[PDB]
Design a protein around this nucleic acid. Structure first.
Ligand SMILES: [Ca+2]
Ligand SMILES: [Ca+2]
Ligand SMILES: [Ca+2]
Ligand SMILES: [Ca+2]
Length: 298
DNA sequence: GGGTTTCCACTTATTCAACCTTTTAG
DNA sequence: CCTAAAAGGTTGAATAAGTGGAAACC
């Protein structure tokens, strides 16, 4: 059932789940020896295929396909379709550092719109653009286009623009979790509700702003080898009851995350009724938990 | 139909989400 | 003593991003 997604929900979701793409491919059938492909894409779990169909219908662009065993993607690379992407993100701009990637995608669009990508000089300009996009140059492009190139990206400083963006972002990178803490009590399990949003460290400022915007929570920094990311986290029930739950009751989530939030809420009500301290209440929470998050079948 | 664009199957890197246990706060 | 909140992580790919191959187009 195709439903129109609000454009700021969509942009918040794009900030959490979109990726731009710029292919500069060796091609023995291209006059300059390289062909290109420019686009935007989203990859989700199969259980969320509906989001992709809603976006495909809301925009009128893109093609949907399996992405391996368990995921599905919406890719938009038809050049004329990319005008839709630009019109959307011009009106409802990305908020995270991905915004810099959007601007690089715009620059590549302009090169191609002037048909300059059919010249080697235009291929070279696309390479300079791609050197700053996402993961930058591949080994093949480094080898083929030796050049000291600026690598500094525009640092993005933008406030959360409105709460629909936040609902979109949370639908992508958020998590509603029932933590079962093993204790020695007679019941022997403490039920703890956790709300989290996870993000690369490059957007520490935006994540830190969530403390102010939502009136609760804290930031946990995590490092693993050379990689760093952050979790905005809320574990205090009174904050979950009075701030997190009413926020998302008002600003609706999309996809499977919505059902997780609803289940989470059913656990919160049980907790408020103190039935998490009874055996029968705990069994019910355990049963709700088994069907949340990755365990959910559909 | 030659050069170019678009699509579709599928993979690589690593940023997510989701999942744990132990300790501290109240 | 008791429960709630925070601290302190780990797991593993539903990560973000990218690739190989060719059909479709004009
Ligand atoms: Ca994300
Ligand atoms: Ca994704
Ligand atoms: Ca997600
Ligand atoms: Ca995500």
């Amino acid at each position: 059932r195709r439903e129109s997604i609000n454009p700021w929900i969509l942009t918040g979701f794009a900030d959490a789940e979109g990726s731009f793409l710029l292919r500069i491919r060796k091609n023995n059938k291209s006059s300059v020896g390289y062909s290109t492909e420019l686009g935007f894409q989203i990859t989700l779990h199969n259980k969320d295929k509906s989001i992709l169909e809603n976006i495909q219908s809301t925009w009128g662009v893109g093609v949907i396909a399996n992405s391996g065993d368990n995921a599905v993607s919406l890719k938009v690379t038809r050049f004329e379709d990319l005008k839709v992407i630009i019109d959307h993100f011009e009106k409802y701009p990305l908020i995270t550092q991905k915004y810099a990637d959007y601007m690089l995608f715009k620059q590549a669009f302009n090169v191609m719109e002037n048909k300059e990508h059919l010249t080697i000089e235009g291929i070279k300009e696309l390479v300079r653009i791609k050197a700053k996009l996402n993961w930058g140059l591949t080994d093949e492009l480094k080898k083929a286009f030796p050049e000291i190139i600026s690598k500094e990206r525009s640092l993005i400083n933008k406030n959360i623009p409105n709460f629909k963006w936040l609902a979109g972002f949370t639908s992508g990178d958020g998590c509603f979790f029932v933590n079962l803490i093993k204790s020695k009590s007679k019941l022997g399990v403490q039920v703890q509700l956790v709300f989290s949003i996870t993000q690369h460290i490059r957007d520490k400022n935006l994540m830190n702003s969530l403390i102010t915007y939502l009136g609760c929570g804290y930031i946990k920094k995590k490092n693993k080898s050379e990689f760093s990311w952050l979790d905005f986290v809320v574990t205090k029930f009174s904050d979950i009851r009075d701030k997190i739950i009413p926020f998302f009751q008002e600003y609706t989530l999309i996809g499977t995350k919505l059902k997780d939030f609803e289940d989470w809420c059913k656990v919160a009500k049980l907790i408020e009724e103190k039935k998490h301290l009874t055996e029968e209440g705990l069994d019910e929470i355990k049963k709700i938990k088994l069907n949340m998050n990755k365990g959910r079948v559909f």
